[PDB]
Amino acid sequence: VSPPPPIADEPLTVNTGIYLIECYSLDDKAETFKVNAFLSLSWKDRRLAFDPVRSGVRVKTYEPEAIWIPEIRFVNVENARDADVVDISVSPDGTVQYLERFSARVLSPLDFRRYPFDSQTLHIYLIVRSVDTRNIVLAVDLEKVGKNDDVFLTGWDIESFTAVVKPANFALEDRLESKLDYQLRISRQYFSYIPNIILPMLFILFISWTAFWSTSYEANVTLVVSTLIAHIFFNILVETNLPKTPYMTYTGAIIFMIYLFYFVAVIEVTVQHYLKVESQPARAASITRASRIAFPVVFLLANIILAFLFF
Amino acid sequence: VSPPPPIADEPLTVNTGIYLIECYSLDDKAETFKVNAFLSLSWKDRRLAFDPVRSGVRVKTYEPEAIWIPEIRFVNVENARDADVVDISVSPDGTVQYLERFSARVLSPLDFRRYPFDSQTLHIYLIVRSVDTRNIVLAVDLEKVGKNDDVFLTGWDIESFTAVVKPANFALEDRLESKLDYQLRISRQYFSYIPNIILPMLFILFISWTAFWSTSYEANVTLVVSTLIAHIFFNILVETNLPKTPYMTYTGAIIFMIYLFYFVAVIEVTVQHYLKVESQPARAASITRASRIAFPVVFLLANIILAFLFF
Amino acid sequence: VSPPPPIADEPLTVNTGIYLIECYSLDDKAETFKVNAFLSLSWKDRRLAFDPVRSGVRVKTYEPEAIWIPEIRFVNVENARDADVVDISVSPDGTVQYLERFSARVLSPLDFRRYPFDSQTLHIYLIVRSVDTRNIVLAVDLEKVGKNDDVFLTGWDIESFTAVVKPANFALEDRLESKLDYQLRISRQYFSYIPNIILPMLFILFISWTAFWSTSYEANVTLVVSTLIAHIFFNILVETNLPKTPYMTYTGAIIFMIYLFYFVAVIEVTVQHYLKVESQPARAASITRASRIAFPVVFLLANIILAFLFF
Amino acid sequence: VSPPPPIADEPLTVNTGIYLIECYSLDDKAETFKVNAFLSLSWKDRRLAFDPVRSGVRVKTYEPEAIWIPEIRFVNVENARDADVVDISVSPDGTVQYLERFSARVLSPLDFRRYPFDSQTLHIYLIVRSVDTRNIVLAVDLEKVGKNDDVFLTGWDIESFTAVVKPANFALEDRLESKLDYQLRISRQYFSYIPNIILPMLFILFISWTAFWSTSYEANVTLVVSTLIAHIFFNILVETNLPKTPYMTYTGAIIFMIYLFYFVAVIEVTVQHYLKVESQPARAASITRASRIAFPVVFLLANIILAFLFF
Amino acid sequence: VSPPPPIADEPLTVNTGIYLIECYSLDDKAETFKVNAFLSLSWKDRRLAFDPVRSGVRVKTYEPEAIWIPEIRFVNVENARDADVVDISVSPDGTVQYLERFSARVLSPLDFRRYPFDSQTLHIYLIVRSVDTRNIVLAVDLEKVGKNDDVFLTGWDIESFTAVVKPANFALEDRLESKLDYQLRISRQYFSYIPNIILPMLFILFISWTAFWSTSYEANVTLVVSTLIAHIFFNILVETNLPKTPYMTYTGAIIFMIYLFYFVAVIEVTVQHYLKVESQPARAASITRASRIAFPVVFLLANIILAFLFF
Ligand SMILES: [Cl-]
Ligand SMILES: [Cl-]
Ligand SMILES: [Cl-]
Ligand SMILES: [Cl-]
Ligand SMILES: [Cl-]
Ligand code: NA
Ligand code: NA
Ligand code: NA
Ligand code: NA
Ligand code: NA
Ligand code: NA
Ligand SMILES: [Rb+]
């Protein structure tokens, strides 16, 4: 089999569509997601044209091997898609309608800057390489782009699935290449982060501040050091759910900042004890009373500054 | 091969059945389960009809390639099922009886609201896409729906395996699609959660309340902070067995609430010490004595409220 | 290709044998094990009869596709076995000798009641479904059932590999099925559980009992709470190696009981401090002295009772 | 099919090119990386030559089975590459232009000496074995070596992708083998290690040094022992992201050294308490005051020495 | 195709060789390793002999399907090897030279008795089953046994790769079987265990011994209990990198013994406090002073005894 010949000099237009059936396994660390979808293809092949009056048949069904089919690939996949051809239909004018159901693991970078209050645009890049006989170009049939109502991505809200209609046509290894960008817009369900990570982390921090209403050095050391260790556990827990980024994430910033608060609280607890031992408790009392206001106030202002810089 | 032609304009009815052989790997985090079953198919193909007398047989056995077979798929699968055809039998009137043994990983959302005292309805959606030649509709042969007595799903009780007899017929990319819903009802074996998570979590909380029979600030700080950290360990342990949900689970609610009890116990321990230092122990004694009753009472009432809201 | 025809009316007997080459990956949580074995099959197919004089050869060698082969399956497998035909030898009367080497992941439930001092009976169920032309039945050739001397299952002792000679013949979806039960008896190597989990857990418990020779409340709180937390770590460690069971395991029972001992030790430590503060140390001394005997005695008796209930 | 015959006695030159499409999964522990790329091949096959005039075609397309294709393999792969032939074009003189898209898991050793401030040279070794008919040699077509601009390796910066033009020709199993070295130069994005591991580890160490401004043995024991345990947690965390090396890594060196600082701080805390109890606090005071300067100074100098030895 | 016929009554000798290209994934817990190698086979097939002067060709290259090839398998593999035939060469006398490149996951038991100072002998067992026509026996061509210089097994030193030249010929299921033992000798790179596990474990133990220079019960309880818990963390860490063994490993023995030292240190700390409270500090002082010498001395002697028993 060979490509359909051009009537003039025009490139062959392959109309495409992706209909999402299943979305699963959005892996943050790997920056991948798995997809199960319909891929639809359409192009004119005049060699396949027939008479509907004499044939009595409106459509002809072909097996993939019987006809020429464009070699469509995904750019951002781990391995080549697992595909099963569903149908091939030819209209009397020779317009071919191809439909396959496929499954693939897609590589798509994620921006963790606003984590866990982040939104993402996942991409599925469709591609075709031109043949020596003729140039192949891709197009979007919007009537064949969509998603099943039941499509759910655990821990995410699916906003939209659209295609950028204009392909990116470019040369690669001395041939033309035609690339389409299918975009799946998602927003993270931040809910669970509140009772599981955020609030527990704030509770232990506030517990360390009870040391500002205590003169007992021994108890103070226990309060600040114990809660700091619990903070380390939360830091480790958070970093296991995320890849290593060349930038600060919102959660990372807060987690990092909280260490500074524990560090300064240890200095205060130390200074307080030192003055008490040096028979200067009135001074120690002034520092401790100031700390009761300073710590929550600086914590609130630093958080307002951070939220402002990140959102 | 082509579909059986319609005598009038009728859709082709494909009778289905699923007989479960094995159920395994119900993954809560992934919201998947693995299945090994028999899939049975039946439809009328007049072109296959024969005379028993002339042929000298009452049944005819074909190879899948020799005859037309409907392209039946599962909607909610990760990848296409691994299937092996067992038998194809034709009756004199062209009634085809198809049997395959398959294995598949099924995506089925889970409701964790009542975890670990939850029940689920797992779905296996069977689907067929109509052809240009004819419309294909699915039906349930109840005599061919069932499960082996030995079918066990580790950590779950299997209640029933039934099919919703009326298919959900709908248009998808200008073709009729016929969808059947096979339902596997299961209930979680909550037993082990009691000695492993629930009771240990209650024991550490009750241990934190012994601080209401102690005047020692240093010992109190140790009792409350240590038990809080152990509570954080249980919270982390629980959240590892579950996906992130945009709602509160029953266990999640209790775990979250217990933090508030630890937070208020730290306030009480702090207030008690502060008053003792300020030479007002009679007051501190009133707060501590009230706490001995208030803490267990509020804990019991809050749990009754939560159980009521969740069950 | 169709089944061999009956001389009279008898069912076709397929003689079977399983020879184990490798046993690996007994996964307690999944209740699976991997197997690499020889599957031997033997049946008479008179349509394959030949004259050694004419054909030259005394035994014919065939390719699986060239002849009829019974569709033998495993019941309790995750996916269909990976098999490679080693030989298909046909003798002059038409007796076929089939040999394949296969690998499979077998689902076989485990009884954890006596863990880690438990024994198991793993099953490999061989099955054949009857056809319309004729009924197929399975038999065991004991001369072809066995295991390699080097077969080792990490963490287990292999006792025996035998087959229940009588097949279970039954109706399934309006056709006969013939099922054979191959049994692999194993016993767990409990050795490592003693220095790794059992003894460390007993040491920390005995360490908490040193609080019965101390009047220091602060030190007592540290002894009992610290060792309790280490006990929680061991409980978590143990539960990670096991699935969730709707029953108590032997280890689970001991682990659970030890929590009660920690809970009562905290009560004793609290009661002792309370009386000391109330200027009644003589009483506190009576309770502490009784505790020195009561705790180890009740621990020993409770363990005798548990061992009796479980073994 | 057989190799192209030599016009004289020359070896057959197979021109190669690798164009990287995707780079993912650089696993430090496994010392592997996954690659998705174009592999281009070019060689002259006289037997396939044609006259453009009598053919009416300027180029001829073939199926891989129709013509002789060199058996090109990768040396450093886990399993053989998953490849899909994209195009095979033949020019009039019989110059073949082969293009495949492949995916492979590459084994490439990593030098962790400067971790996490390390750079690596990943290798992809292309190989061909000679035949009895003729010697097959590999060459690099520099015009066909490259990478997509969007190629991103999570946690790394990609510097260059070049090929060593001269192949390594040698005998292997009595046939000559022609090996090409494709080099991917990368540098680790160390950013995240600073707020996640480095700074938290320094904060806890500095917190242990507050014991040099405290006379309280009980509080000192708590400060030093608690922070040491948190240091053990960071040591464990770091070692989980790395394979076991027969050398010291930069991070490993610092982590190890910090243990010595904790060990000496415990000695100081012990010596201080001992002298205090022995009624010699003036002495203890001299040791403690010296420690306040000595600990940070020796820490800074040891770090300058280490950075010097490693960079 | 059928086997080559015997000239007299001799078994067919299949000469073998394994040349290691890659060694990776030595999994201690699973007792497996992955291998990528060349497998060479050689045997005489007279039915394939040809005239060198008449034919003009010195060697004939065949496709695997065109000729008879012995069915060679590996005994100790998880699944059948992934193999790709590289070349088949026939010399005039009919000597066949077969070469394939394969990848396999090999099951090979490991002796952990001396861990982490252990050495292992990994096995790759090659096997052939005889046919009815004739007996097939295996031999080693030492000229075709070896390994690439770049072969590295992360965390191990590769010593030698040799074959036991004499096959183990035995009857299995009424046919002869010929088995060859290929041995890969390796020694563990123990280096990293020293700064990561051994030294940190010794540091915490020595820190517990500072309690012998302290009269503070409260501080002593904190020193011994805290360090014991850190020892439990190291015990857990070590046991995660190892399978469960029916014997004691060297590291396991030391780890277990260290618990006894912590247990006796708690007794000493308890006895010391008890005597102090009973107004007998002179005695307590004798026990504490003896402990300062006894603990390190008994620790050193017990380690010399253990090293002697294990090495
Ligand atoms: Cl693709
Ligand atoms: Cl499917
Ligand atoms: Cl099977
Ligand atoms: Cl390859
Ligand atoms: Cl093999
Ligand atoms: Na085609
Ligand atoms: Na068909
Ligand atoms: Na067959
Ligand atoms: Na070829
Ligand atoms: Na062959
Ligand atoms: Na303390
Ligand atoms: Rb104290």
Domain boundaries in chain E? 1-192, 193-311
Q: In chain B, how many H helices and how many E strands?
A: 6, 11
Looking at residue C76, what DSSP letter applies? S
A216 shares contact with chain D (CB less than 8 Å): no
Nearest CA in chain E to C62: E1
Interface with A, mutate which of B69, B105, B170, B173 (most A CBs under 10 A) = B173
A306 shares contact with chain D (CB less than 8 Å): no
CA E37 to chain centroid, in Å, comes to 18
Residues in A closer than 8 angstroms to D89, CB to CB, are: 132
Characterize the bridge pairing of strands C60-61 and B156-171.
unpaired
Token digits of residue D105: 């898991």
User: A62: CA distance to ligand 1 center in Å?
Assistant: 22
Among candidates B116, E76, B42, which has minimal Cα distance to C24? E76
Q: In whole angstroms, what is the distance from residue A203 CA to residue B263 CA?
A: 7
Please report which helix (H) or strand (E) contains residue C146, including its range.
strand C146-147
Q: Do E225 and C226 touch (CB under 8 A)?
A: yes
Q: In whole angstroms, what is the distance from residue B34 CA to residue E60 CA?
A: 51
* Residue found under tokens 């618990």: E259
Q: How many CB atoms lie within 10 A of CB A20?
A: 20
Nearest 5°: phi and psi at B120? -135, 155
Q: In whole angstroms, what is the distance from residue C246 CA to residue B188 CA?
A: 10
Among candidates E194, E199, E189, E198, which has minimal Cα distance to D246? E189
C76 shares contact with chain B (CB less than 8 Å): yes
Q: In whole angstroms, what is the distance from residue D206 CA to residue D202 CA?
A: 6
Q: Do B243 and A154 touch (CB under 8 A)?
A: yes
Q: Which residues pair with C22 in a beta bridge?
A: C36
Q: In whole angstroms, what is the distance from residue E289 CA to residue E212 CA?
A: 7
Q: In whole angstroms, what is the distance from residue A196 CA to residue A206 CA?
A: 16
Q: Which residues pair with B40 in a beta bridge?
A: B17, B99
> In angstroms, what is the resolution?
3.2
Q: In whole angstroms, what is the distance from residue A250 CA to residue A114 CA?
A: 5
User: D218: CA distance to ligand 12 center in Å?
Assistant: 7
Residue D102 neighbours by CB under 8 Å, 6+ apart: D36, D37, D38, D39, D81, D82, D83, D84
Report the residue from E144, E154, E230 with minimal CB separation from D232: E230
Q: In whole angstroms, what is the distance from residue B102 CA to residue B38 CA?
A: 6
C-alpha distance from B229 to closest chain A C-alpha (Å): 7
8 Å CB contact between D243 and D29:
yes
Beta strands per DSSP E along chain A? 12-27, 32-44, 60-61, 72-74, 82-90, 95-107, 119-129, 136-140, 146-147, 156-171, 176-188
Beta strands per DSSP E along chain B? 12-27, 32-44, 60-61, 72-74, 82-90, 95-107, 119-129, 136-140, 146-147, 156-171, 176-188
E17 shares contact with chain D (CB less than 8 Å): yes
Please report which helix (H) or strand (E) contains residue A266, including its range.
helix A250-277
Nearest CA in chain C to B238: C236
Concatenating the DSSP letter of every residue in chain D gives --PPPPSSSPPEEEEEEEEEEEEEEEETTTTEEEEEEEEEEEEE-GGG---HHHH--SSEE--TTTS----EEESSBSS--EEEEEEEEE-TT-EEEEEEEEEEEEE-----TTTTS-EEEEEEEEEEE--SS--EEEEE-GGG-EE-TT--BTTEEEEEEEEEEEEEEEESSSSEEEEEEEEEEEEE--TTHIIIIIHHHHHHHHHHGGGGG---HHHHHHHHHHHHHHHHHHHHHHHHTS---SS--HHHHHHHHHHHHHHHHHHHHHHHHHHHHTT-HHHHHHHHHHHHHHHHHHHHHHHHHHHHHH-
Q: How many CB atoms lie within 10 A of CB D90?
A: 21
For C103: left if phi > 0, alpha if psi spans -120 to 50, otherwise beta; the answer is beta
The torsion defined by the Cα of A230, A232, A234 and A237, in degrees rounded to 10, comes to: -130
Cis before B116? omega within 30: yes
E93 shares contact with chain D (CB less than 8 Å): no
Concatenating the DSSP letter of every residue in D49-100 gives ---HHHH--SSEE--TTTS----EEESSBSS--EEEEEEEEE-TT-EEEEEE
User: C167: CA distance to ligand 3 center in Å?
Assistant: 17
E83 shares contact with chain D (CB less than 8 Å): no
Ligand nearest, relative to CA of residue B216: 12
Among candidates C194, B266, D170, B209, which has minimal Cα distance to E259? C194
Token digits of residue A198: 């955020």
Nearest CA in chain D to A173: D144
Query: What residue type is E115 in one-letter code?
Result: Y
Residues in B closer than 8 angstroms to C75, CB to CB, are: 21-22, 148
Please report which helix (H) or strand (E) contains residue C96, including its range.
strand C95-107
Query: What residue type is A280 in one-letter code?
Result: Q
C131 shares contact with chain B (CB less than 8 Å): yes
A276 exposure class (CB count in 10 Å sphere: 0-12, 13-18, 19+): middle
CA A155 to chain centroid, in Å, comes to 11
Q: In whole angstroms, what is the distance from residue E27 CA to residue E35 CA?
A: 12
Token digits of residue C118: 């438990």
Q: Do A222 and B222 touch (CB under 8 A)?
A: yes
Q: In whole angstroms, what is the distance from residue C192 CA to residue C198 CA?
A: 9
Q: Which chains touch C (3 or more CB pairs under 8 A)?
A: B, E
Q: How many CB atoms lie within 10 A of CB B198?
A: 16
Report the residue from B22, B86, B234 with minimal CB separation from C71: B86
Residues in B closer than 8 angstroms to A214, CB to CB, are: 217, 270, 273-274
Q: Which residues pair with E20 in a beta bridge?
A: E37, E147
B263 shares contact with chain A (CB less than 8 Å): yes
Q: Which chains touch E (3 or more CB pairs under 8 A)?
A: C, D
Q: Do E192 and D75 touch (CB under 8 A)?
A: no
Nearest 5°: phi and psi at C222? -65, -45
CA E74 to each of CA C82, E102, E124: distance values in angstroms, whole numbers, following the listed order: 15, 11, 7
A263 shares contact with chain D (CB less than 8 Å): yes
Q: In whole angstroms, what is the distance from residue D260 CA to residue E199 CA?
A: 10
Q: In whole angstroms, what is the distance from residue B23 CA to residue C76 CA?
A: 10
8 Å CB contact between B27 and B51:
no
Q: In whole angstroms, what is the distance from residue C203 CA to residue E213 CA?
A: 24
Q: Per CATH, the architecture of B193-311 is what?
A: Up-down Bundle (1.20)
Ligand nearest, relative to CA of residue C225: 11
Looking at residue A195, what DSSP letter applies? I
The method of structure determination was X-ray
End-to-end CA distance of chain D: 56
Cα C248–Cα C253–Cα C256 angle in degrees, nearest 5: 115
Nearest CA in chain B to A148: B172
E241 shares contact with chain D (CB less than 8 Å): no
- Long-range contacts for A272-275 (Cβ within 8 Å, ≥24 apart)? A272/A215, A272/A217, A272/A220, A273/A217, A273/A220, A273/D213, A273/D214, A273/D216, A273/D219, A274/D213, A274/D214
Residue D71 neighbours by CB under 8 Å, 6+ apart: D128, D129, E86
Ligand nearest, relative to CA of residue E70: 10
- Tell whether domain A1-192 is in CATH 2.70.170.10: yes
Query: What residue type is A202 in one-letter code?
Result: L
User: D140: CA distance to ligand 9 center in Å?
Assistant: 21
The dihedral built from the CA positions of residue A44, A50, A52 and A53, taken in this order, carries a sign that is: positive
Among candidates E110, E108, E106, which has minimal Cα distance to E120? E110
